[PDB]
Amino acid sequence: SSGSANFAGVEYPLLPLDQHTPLLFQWFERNPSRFGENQIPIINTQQNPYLNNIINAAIIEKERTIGVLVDGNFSAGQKKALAKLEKQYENIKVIYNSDLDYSMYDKKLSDIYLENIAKIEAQPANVRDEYLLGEIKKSLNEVLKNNPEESLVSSHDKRLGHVRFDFYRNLFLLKGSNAFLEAGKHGCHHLQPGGGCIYLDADMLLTGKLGTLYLPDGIAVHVSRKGNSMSLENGIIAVNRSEHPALKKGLEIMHSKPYGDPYIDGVCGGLRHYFNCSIRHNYEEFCNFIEFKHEHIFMDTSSLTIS
Fold this sequence. Notes:
- The chain is of the alpha/beta class.
- The protein folds into two domains: about 1-110 and about 150-305, no CATH class; about 110-150, no CATH class.
- The chain is about 35% helix and about 20% strand.
- The chain contains ten helices and eleven strands.
- The strands form three sheets. It has a six-stranded mixed beta sheet, sandwiched between helices.
- The protein is globular, with a radius of gyration of 20 Å.
- It starts with a strand and ends in a 9-residue tail after the last strand.
- The relative contact order is 0.16.
- It is found in: Host cell; Secreted.
- InterPro entries: SseK_NleB (IPR057545).
- Belongs to the glycosyltransferase NleB family.
- Its cofactor is Mn(2+).
């Protein structure tokens, strides 16, 4: 009726993401002291003009709510600078990650390990992952000895680098438009409960309005191409509704896999299971089917050099 896309002998209707589906940027700062005590604690050099890229997207998309999910040990003056950024740009909403309740998506590590110890033991010995079974029992022992209430959220709260960003990115997108309402952001134009969200990496420059997008079952992700290879990525994630069952599938993998990675399993694994991009299927065909394509999204150029 409004479009249709085919992958692995299954039809997926192209579902619309209206022009008021909010945009999401994410800045988790590990050293806020590198910025001045009265500066917006987002990197903004000429190598990484991330704050400028976020503003330019907010300037282009006037009517659309622009979300910025932040985290870190910011000084009081840095939070006022962020508070003033929300004042200069009416559509910019700064959401602190600590203000959101993710407990409904959480699971105890001891629960995951026990399930897998039972699951692997039921497999005959000639097929059991013997190395993994010992590792899980080892992981369970350390949880019971050091932090028996450790959960996916608490364990990921302690990690460093991208794995903790990627973790909360998937969870925010499951909240979707509700996250802005939960965070108490007033006046978000046409923001509806149950609505979707469009995450964009901060090193990408939006040069024109996205308009209305039409994505298979209302989801699409970035597909990066390096050399002669392509790969599913989380640099762009667009969903047309909250709790999108594909992202929910990625979380379900996190709840059943012993050492689930928020990127490999929460995004790539969830997408491949959801659309049946099996090991025997054409990964290249899936990439073209699921790829977020838009003329007005521009890749970072500062990356580049001779060759």
